[PDB]
From Swiss-Prot:
Residues 239-459 form the N7-MTase domain. It is found in: Host cytoplasm; Host endoplasmic reticulum. The chain holds residues 5949 to 6449 of 7096 of the full protein. This is Guanine-N7 methyltransferase nsp14. It comes from Severe acute respiratory syndrome coronavirus 2 (2019-nCoV). It comes from the Viruses. S-adenosyl-L-methionine binds at D274, I275, G276, N277, P278, K279, A280. Mg(2+) 1 binds at D67, E134.
Length: 459
């Protein structure tokens, strides 16, 4: 039960305005045949063009919304819309391209998908709200067959060239003219009432309808992300390493230890309220403080209301000591907080566009994150960069130019000359910090926080 049986029934009601007379009784097998493709009873790794919801969720990085609108069916021009914002007009002879034959339109489709997907995924999943013209247009830019490898590398083939008769992955496809063995899913098969816009607009106010194909493509993918990652959540699903996941995750643990250790040293809070992941461990295990944990899963829909987290009656006195919100997204942080908050607006290979201004951050697991909101931090200030160490100045065991920095908070810098060990550790910490910030994480702290208070923790 891993792949979608071609003998599964497909509901055709959504197709019958573009394809009048379409049979009510329809399988994937007969739909694929109707789309002009032949599957030849092939056991060669491509059992169906269409995939299950579970398979689609495992391949979220591959998702490309796709819509086709009648522009005036072989007689008339077609507007091809993609969740990339691209609109192409194909003639049978926000970006909006003038009408051109299929032989040149297919070249632009391969370039667009290859540049979008090469750093994300080994495939494409076309996310549909299928009404018929999108399915009958696939024969003009898709070829299918056995699973293949790239002509220049070991990656599976995603593109075909009629010029050279060869196959390529997204990395090696320059000049290629056909999409090869795409996948697709029709969201309309999931059991909705009413049209795309009415279902999309229940959950999201950020994607409008300009009545162009790319708008529908964007709304379709947005609705699918809502259904699979907002209303439903699965943190058991692991996703492949495609980038700096491991360095980012390590940097996060190092920065969290540094910042909390320094806040406790600087302001000597008697209690810390650690609000968020129910799996969280003490990030500063040697600290003197009373460490109290409060369980909150990562919110995927709306930021938590601080009133619901804290009130309904716990130390209960969250105004005592300091509150730690490490990726615990709330509408408004209390004044006595240490905060790490993911900025959903960040461009990266890990951060995919999401629902209602939220983003889908995929790093080992998929986390749909509510829209970044600057107003959440009104009681706090941005945490400045600093490095603190009480460790002995001792090298042990890479070449040196002497470090000069006001933000190297060590005995040796207090003494007027940074030692090689603390210089090496500072530069490693600065790289880790810049990695985590570049990844989209933002750091906020209570307004009284002052690194000047750390110098007297050496005497
Ligand atoms: Zn390749
Ligand atoms: Zn939306
Ligand atoms: Zn030192």
């Amino acid at each position: 039960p891993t792949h979608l049986s071609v003998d599964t029934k497909f509901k055709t009601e959504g197709l019958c305005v573009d394809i009048p007379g379409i049979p009510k009784d329809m399988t994937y097998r007969r739909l694929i045949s109707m789309m002009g493709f032949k599957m030849n009873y092939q056991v060669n790794g491509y059992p169906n063009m269409f995939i299950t919801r579970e398979e689609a969720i495992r391949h979220v990085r591959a998702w490309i919304g796709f819509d086709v609108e009648g522009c005036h069916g072989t007689n008339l021009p077609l507007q091809l819309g993609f969740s990339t914002g691209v609109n192409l007009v194909a003639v049978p002879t926000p970006l909006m391209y003038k009408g051109l034959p299929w032989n040149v339109v297919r070249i632009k489709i391969v370039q667009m998908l290859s540049d979008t997907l090469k750093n994300l995924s080994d495939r494409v999943v076309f996310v549909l709200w299928a009404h018929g013209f999108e399915l009958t247009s696939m024969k003009y830019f898709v070829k299918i067959g056995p699973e293949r490898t790239c002509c220049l590398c070991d990656r599976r083939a995603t593109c075909f060239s009629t010029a050279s008769d060869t196959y390529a992955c997204w990395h090696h496809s320059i000049g290629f003219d056909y999409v090869y063995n795409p996948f697709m899913i029709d969201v309309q098969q999931w059991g909705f009432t009413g049209n795309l816009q009415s279902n999309h607009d229940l959950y999201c106010q950020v994607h409008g309808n300009a009545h162009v194909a790319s708008c529908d493509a964007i709304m379709t993918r947005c609705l699918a992300v809502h259904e699979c990652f907002v209303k439903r959540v699965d943190w058991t699903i692991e996703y492949p390493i495609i980038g700096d996941e491991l360095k980012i995750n390590a940097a996060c643990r190092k920065v969290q230890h540094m910042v909390v250790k320094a806040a406790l040293l600087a302001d000597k809070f008697p209690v810390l309220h650690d609000i968020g992941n129910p799996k969280a461990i003490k990030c500063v295990p040697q600290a003197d403080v009373e460490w109290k944990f409060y369980d909150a899963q990562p919110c995927s829909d709306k930021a938590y209301k601080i009133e619901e987290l804290f009130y309904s009656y716990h130390s209960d006195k969250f105004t005592d000591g300091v509150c730690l919100f490490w990726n615990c997204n709330v509408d408004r942080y209390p004044a006595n907080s240490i905060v790490c908050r993911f900025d959903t607006r960040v461009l990266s290979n890990l951060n995919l566009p999401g629902c209602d201004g939220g983003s889908l951050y995929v790093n080992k697991h998929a986390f749909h994150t509510p829209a970044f909101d600057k107003s959440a931090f009104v009681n706090l200030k941005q945490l400045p960069f600093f490095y603190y160490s009480d460790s002995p100045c001792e090298s042990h065991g890479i070449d040196y130019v002497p470090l000069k920095s006001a933000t190297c908070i060590t005995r040796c810098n207090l003494g007027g000359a940074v030692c090689r060990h603390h210089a090496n550790e500072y530069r490693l910490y600065l790289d880790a910090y810049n990695m985590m910030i570049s990844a989209g994480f933002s750091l906020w702290v209570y307004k009284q926080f002052d690194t000047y208070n750390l110098w007297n923790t050496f005497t």
